[PDB]
Amino acid sequence: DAVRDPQTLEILDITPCSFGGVSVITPGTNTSNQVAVLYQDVNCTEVNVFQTRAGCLIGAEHVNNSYECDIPIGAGICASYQTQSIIAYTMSLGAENSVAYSNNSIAIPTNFTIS
Amino acid sequence: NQKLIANQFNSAIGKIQDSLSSTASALGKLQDVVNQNAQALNTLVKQLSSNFGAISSVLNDILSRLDPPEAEVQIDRLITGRLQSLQTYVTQQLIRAAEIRASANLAATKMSECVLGQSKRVDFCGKGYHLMSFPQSAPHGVVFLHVTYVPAQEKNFTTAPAICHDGKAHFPREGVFVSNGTHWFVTQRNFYEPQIITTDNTFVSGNCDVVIGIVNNTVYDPLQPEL
Amino acid sequence: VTTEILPVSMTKTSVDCTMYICGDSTECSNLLLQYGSFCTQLNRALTGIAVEQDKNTQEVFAQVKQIYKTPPIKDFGGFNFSQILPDPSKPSKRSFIEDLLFNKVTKFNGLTVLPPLLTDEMIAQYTSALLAGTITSGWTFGAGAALQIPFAMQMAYRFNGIGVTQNVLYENQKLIANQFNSAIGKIQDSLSSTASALGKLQDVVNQNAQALNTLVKQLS
Amino acid sequence: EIRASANLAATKMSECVLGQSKRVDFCGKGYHLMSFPQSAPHGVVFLHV
Amino acid sequence: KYNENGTITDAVDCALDPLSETKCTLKSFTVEKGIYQTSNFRVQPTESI
Ligand SMILES: *[C@@H]1O[C@H](CO)[C@@H](O[C@@H]2O[C@H](CO)[C@@H](O)[C@H](O)[C@H]2NC(C)=O)[C@H](O)[C@H]1NC(C)=O
Ligand SMILES: *[C@@H]1O[C@H](CO)[C@@H](O[C@@H]2O[C@H](CO)[C@@H](O)[C@H](O)[C@H]2NC(C)=O)[C@H](O)[C@H]1NC(C)=O
Ligand SMILES: *[C@@H]1O[C@H](CO)[C@@H](O[C@@H]2O[C@H](CO)[C@@H](O)[C@H](O)[C@H]2NC(C)=O)[C@H](O)[C@H]1NC(C)=O
Ligand SMILES: *[C@@H]1O[C@H](CO)[C@@H](O[C@@H]2O[C@H](CO)[C@@H](O)[C@H](O)[C@H]2NC(C)=O)[C@H](O)[C@H]1NC(C)=O
Numbered sequence: 001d002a003v004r005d006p007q008t009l010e011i012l013d014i015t016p017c018s019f020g021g022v023s024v025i026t027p028g029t030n031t032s033n034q035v036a037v038l039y040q041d042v043n044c045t046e047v048n049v050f051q052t053r054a055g056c057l058i059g060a061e062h063v064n065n066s067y068e069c070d071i072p073i074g075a076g077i078c079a080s081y082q083t084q085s086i087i088a089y090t091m092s093l094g095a096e097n098s099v100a101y102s103n104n105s106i107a108i109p110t111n112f113t114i115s
Numbered sequence: 116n117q118k119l120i121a122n123q124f125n126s127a128i129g130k131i132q133d134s135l136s137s138t139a140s141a142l143g144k145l146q147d148v149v150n151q152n153a154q155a156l157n158t159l160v161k162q163l164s165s166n167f168g169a170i171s172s173v174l175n176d177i178l179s180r181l182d183p184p185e186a187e188v189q190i191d192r193l194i195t196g197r198l199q200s201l202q203t204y205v206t207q208q209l210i211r212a213a214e215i216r217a218s219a220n221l222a223a224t225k226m227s228e229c230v231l232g233q234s235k236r237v238d239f240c241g242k243g244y245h246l247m248s249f250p251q252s253a254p255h256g257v258v259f260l261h262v263t264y265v266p267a268q269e270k271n272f273t274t275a276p277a278i279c280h281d282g283k284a285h286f287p288r289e290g291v292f293v294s295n296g297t298h299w300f301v302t303q304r305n306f307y308e309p310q311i312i313t314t315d316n317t318f319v320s321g322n323c324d325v326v327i328g329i330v331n332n333t334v335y336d337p338l339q340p341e342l
Numbered sequence: 343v344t345t346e347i348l349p350v351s352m353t354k355t356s357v358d359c360t361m362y363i364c365g366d367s368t369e370c371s372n373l374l375l376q377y378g379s380f381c382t383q384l385n386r387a388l389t390g391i392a393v394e395q396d397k398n399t400q401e402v403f404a405q406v407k408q409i410y411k412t413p414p415i416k417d418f419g420g421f422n423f424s425q426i427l428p429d430p431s432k433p434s435k436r437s438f439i440e441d442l443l444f445n446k447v448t449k450f451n452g453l454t455v456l457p458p459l460l461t462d463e464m465i466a467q468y469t470s471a472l473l474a475g476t477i478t479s480g481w482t483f484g485a486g487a488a489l490q491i492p493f494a495m496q497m498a499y500r501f502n503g504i505g506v507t508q509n510v511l512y513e514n515q516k517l518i519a520n521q522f523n524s525a526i527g528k529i530q531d532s533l534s535s536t537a538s539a540l541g542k543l544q545d546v547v548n549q550n551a552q553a554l555n556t557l558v559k560q561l562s
Numbered sequence: 563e564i565r566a567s568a569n570l571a572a573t574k575m576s577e578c579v580l581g582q583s584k585r586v587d588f589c590g591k592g593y594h595l596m597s598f599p600q601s602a603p604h605g606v607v608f609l610h611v
Numbered sequence: 612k613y614n615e616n617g618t619i620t621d622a623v624d625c626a627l628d629p630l631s632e633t634k635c636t637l638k639s640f641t642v643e644k645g646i647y648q649t650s651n652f653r654v655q656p657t658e659s660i
């Protein structure tokens with residue numbers, strides 16, 4: 001955990017050198033040979049760079065627009081291949097839609113489909 | 116609407132064919148099972164090539180080269196390693212089998228409750244109001260075609276929990292009270308079909324001084340014109 | 343009002359089998375390779391678990407395609423849902439009760455932990471949508487479109503559904519709303535004071551912690 | 563075990579929260595009216611009315 | 612990659628780039644859409660003490 005230096009009697013902590021899993025994010029090779037690489041649980045220091053909670057993502061562009069999740073990364077971030085290049089974005093959970101609620105209004109179906 | 120319904124049904128079936136014939140991923144749930152089993156077997160076979168500390172992965176090469184006092188040691192290493200491999204394989208197959216069994220139990224449940232009957236369990240037989248289902252076989256599995264009723268078009272109606280007639284509070288036996296801005300009607304909850312509010316559509320309980328949001332209207336009595 | 347607590351997921355652990363067995367050792371690694379795929383399939387097995395953990399979460403919460411939200415005017419016929427609806431003042435828009443739940447339930451050996459795909463905030467949005475749907479459109483959002491209905495009328499259906507004529511609800515609407523509101527307050531009093539109330543989720547955490555502590559201690 | 567629990571939780575969400583249950587003691591003791599989900603660490607909490 | 616006549620017709624250099632690493636990891640010359648864990652990043656020592 002720590003040692004006492006043998007010449008100077010001071011205590012030094014030993015923190016094993018940064019490491020982590022490496023994952024490759026890719027559209028199928030039937031479409032593209034471009035890839036993005038995720039360095040899991042590391043800072044964008046020792047390793048078009050996007051720092052996410054899941055790790056340091058390199059090669060994917062950070063996009064402000066959300067979309068449906070395609071290739072999940074983690075911590076709310078998903079990646080995809082669009083206009084093409086690899087992008088990363090915060091995933092959408094679906095379209096926002098308020099309900100026209102009131103104490104005297106009811107919506108009643110007038111037609112239907114069989115699916 | 117029988118003709119419309121039959122046409123929508125027939126169309127929906129055609130859509131199923133178009134999807135299944137073109138989208139390989141459509142049956143990913145069954146293909147994945149096959150793939151996992153193939154990997155388990157490929158893994159098990161590849162393990163035979165490992166030495167596990169032995170001079171050779173080939174049993175015959177140990178036997179053809181060493182006398183028993185030494186050959187037995189090398190063989191023990193292969194036996195231990197290969198037994199570990201079988202134990203790993205079997206354990207994985209048992210756990211995987213439990214998953215398949217659970218799936219089969221669900222499939223059997225659906226066959227009994229969804230196909231043989233009609234489900235009242237929401238999203239058990241697909242999204243929407245379940246009508247009927249039809250089974251189809253598949254490699255190592257079952258495919259269910261769930262036929263559901265889904266509301267398609269809707270309108271904004273004004274409503275009320277009850278209607279006052281002569282001071283009595285009238286409630287629908289079935290359906291809700293609605294208003295199109297000038298007239299009140301009573302209609303079934305899942306499909307707009309306005310009816311005249313009559314004593315045969317509503318029932319009386321309590322009065323106008325109790326119900327919150329009760330509105331004034333009239334309730335038609337089919338008997339009075341007959342007398 | 344009763345509370346039912348169910349586990350949905352477990353910590354998405356991941357173990358680097360090479361680093362665990364032969365941490366930074368070339369000589370050991372060369373011997374480890376003689377065991378073939380054992381190291382590789384152990385990593386594969388844990389990965390499979392980590393993957394289904396997100397599948398499990400999505401199956402439970404992501405049952406609604408749209409994110410519904412309640413109106414600015416919380417008029418539900420006397421029913422007070424402010425303790426189960428998201429609190430806008432928080433850094434994470436969770437309800438009062440959810441905060442109570444979160445406040446009760448609680449390295450270099452190749453052992454790491456992966457984040458969930460859906461963060462607590464994402465889950466809060468899903469429960470918010472499901473709740474807003476339930477409150478303003480009843481079950482219609484589950485079948486198709488969210489169709490607005492007055493809350494009191496929604497309850498009328500809920501009563502018919504249990505064999506009680508709807509006039510009972512309306513005649514006793516104030517009583518019912520009061521009993522409901524009281525029951526919710528009781529839930530808060532129980533959850534905030536009884537640690538064991540969430541034992542089912544804490545136990546999962548404890549089992550995983552023990553499994554990892556056991557694995558690490560074995561290195562000695 | 564967790565998966566089985568998650569499957570049950572998902573079942574309840576679909577049948578108890580999105581709908582109304584006719585299954586006795588599925589959504590707590592008594593005649594089920596409605597339920598409301600709440601999130602929790604690694605799980606879901608249902609308030610059954 | 613050995614063809615039906617035992618001729619090597621293709622090959623993947625497993626240390627060329629991250630896609631090649633994925634191809635070697637999956638033992639295939641085709642990679643399906645998704646995210647794959649292929650390796651482990653480790654900071655190397657620069658001097659001995
Ligand atoms: C309910 O919706 C259906 C379609 O889903 C309507 O039927 C279609 O009507 C158009 C004309 O407006 C025709 O061109 C289509 O061929 C019809 N489709 C089918 C399958 O028959 C139906 O008219 C609508 N009913 C109401 C009351 O609005
Ligand atoms: C509400 O529904 C009623 C009944 O259909 C509508 O009243 C009828 O309107 C038609 C013309 O479209 C007349 O020929 C009938 O004689 C009317 N019936 C009665 C009893 O007045 C009414 O117009 C609808 N109101 C709204 C705002 O749409
Ligand atoms: C429904 O109609 C009744 C009359 O049949 C209305 O009753 C009146 O209520 C006010 C307020 O308390 C009294 O001052 C009047 O004397 C009542 N009228 C009669 C004839 O007794 C009632 O207010 C109406 N309700 C709605 C919602 O329109
Ligand atoms: C819903 O219930 C909450 C209590 O949980 C009510 O909030 C309280 O309101 C009183 C009166 O203004 C304040 O003195 C308290 O400090 C509030 N408590 C909290 C925790 O906010 C809320 O007003 C009720 N809402 C409705 C519509 O009934």
Ligand SMILES: *[C@@H]1O[C@H](CO)[C@@H](O[C@@H]2O[C@H](CO)[C@@H](O)[C@H](O)[C@H]2NC(C)=O)[C@H](O)[C@H]1NC(C)=O
Nearest residue numbers: 513514515516517518519520521522523524525
């Ligand atoms: C049904 O039971 C409820 C209580 O659960 C009764 O309501 C209470 O009545 C007392 C007076 O006797 C009040 O002091 C309480 O404040 C009321 N409680 C609530 C929540 O309002 C109700 O009166 C009973 N009804 C019948 C027909 O017996």
Ligand SMILES: *[C@@H]1O[C@H](CO)[C@@H](O)[C@H](O)[C@H]1NC(C)=O
Nearest residue numbers: 027028029030031032139644
């Ligand atoms: C995959 O590649 C083949 C050519 O070999 C092409 O015909 C097919 O449309 C491609 N599929 C996709 C999804 O790009």
Ligand SMILES: *[C@@H]1O[C@H](CO)[C@@H](O)[C@H](O)[C@H]1NC(C)=O
Nearest residue numbers: 042043044045051052053055
């Ligand atoms: C990376 O290091 C910087 C300091 O140089 C720090 O401010 C930042 O928060 C760190 N990011 C992560 C993900 O650790």
Ligand SMILES: *[C@@H]1O[C@H](CO)[C@@H](O)[C@H](O)[C@H]1NC(C)=O
Nearest residue numbers: 050061062063064065088089
């Ligand atoms: C998102 O928009 C903000 C401006 O509101 C901008 O500063 C930021 O750089 C943008 N980020 C990305 C990834 O486009």
Ligand SMILES: *[C@@H]1O[C@H](CO)[C@@H](O)[C@H](O)[C@H]1NC(C)=O
Nearest residue numbers: 100105107108268269270271
């Ligand atoms: C009901 O009215 C609201 C408010 O104008 C509107 O947003 C909504 O689309 C209407 N719904 C229908 C079915 O007409």
Ligand SMILES: *[C@@H]1O[C@H](CO)[C@@H](O)[C@H](O)[C@H]1NC(C)=O
Nearest residue numbers: 102103104327328329417419
């Ligand atoms: C419905 O809401 C409106 C607006 O707040 C209010 O004026 C009206 O009295 C309410 N009616 C009922 C029955 O609650």
Ligand SMILES: *[C@@H]1O[C@H](CO)[C@@H](O)[C@H](O)[C@H]1NC(C)=O
Nearest residue numbers: 613614615616617618619620
């Ligand atoms: C193998 O050799 C034969 C000629 O004898 C040739 O026709 C065939 O295409 C070859 N197979 C492959 C995979 O190249």
